């Protein structure tokens, strides 16, 4: 079923900050804001951790959209191939979540990759989830109206304990 990362990295404080640093032309800014919150809260309701939003500067979890090279070892690659990627908890790049601007993203009302789904998967990595062998899990390694699976909940609660 679920996996963690080696040595179980996790956030150490009861509060974790996050910032949406850059946006996508595909959606209003407020729509991205509301979906990110919804994704975070899917995981947060299960565990003793609370998320605080910031609008400037560096936050623990930096979230954004980018084209091409964007300052880490994993540059984006144009339309297709890689869609998005995220990092396990830690300082600096740890926790951050990046989305390729050269895809099409949707809130559900148009063509595109469903952003809510994608953000819930990526932010699972940002909280310390690896990939699951269970096909029903949000953390299954491939993209394929939803909820966390029982395997997703068991894994996140193994790492943080229960709310």
């Amino acid at each position: 079923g679920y996996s963690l990362f080696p040595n179980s990295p996790k956030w150490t404080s009861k509060v974790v900050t996050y910032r949406i640093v850059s946006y996508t032309r595909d959606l209003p800014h407020i729509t991205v804001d509301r979906l990110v919150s919804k994704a975070l809260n899917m995981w947060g309701k299960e565990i003793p951790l609370h998320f605080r939003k910031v609008v400037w500067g560096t936050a623990d979890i930096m979230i954004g959209f980018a084209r091409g090279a964007h300052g880490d070892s994993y540059p984006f690659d144009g339309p297709g191939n890689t869609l998005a990627h995220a990092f396990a908890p830690g300082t600096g790049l740890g926790g951050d979540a990046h989305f390729d601007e050269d895809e099409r993203w949707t809130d559900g009302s148009s063509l595109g990759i469903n952003f809510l789904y994608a953000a819930t998967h990526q932010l699972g990595h940002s909280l310390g989830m690896g990939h699951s062998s269970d096909p029903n899990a949000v953390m299954y390694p491939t993209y394929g109206n939803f909820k966390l699976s029982q395997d997703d909940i068991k894994g996140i609660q193994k790492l943080y304990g229960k709310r």
Binding site: F5, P6, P9, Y74, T82, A84, H85, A86, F87, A88, G90, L93, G94, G124, H125, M129, G130, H131
Partner: peptide
């Protein structure tokens, strides 16, 4: 993609 660092 989930990377360590």
């Amino acid at each position: 993609x989930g990377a360590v660092x």
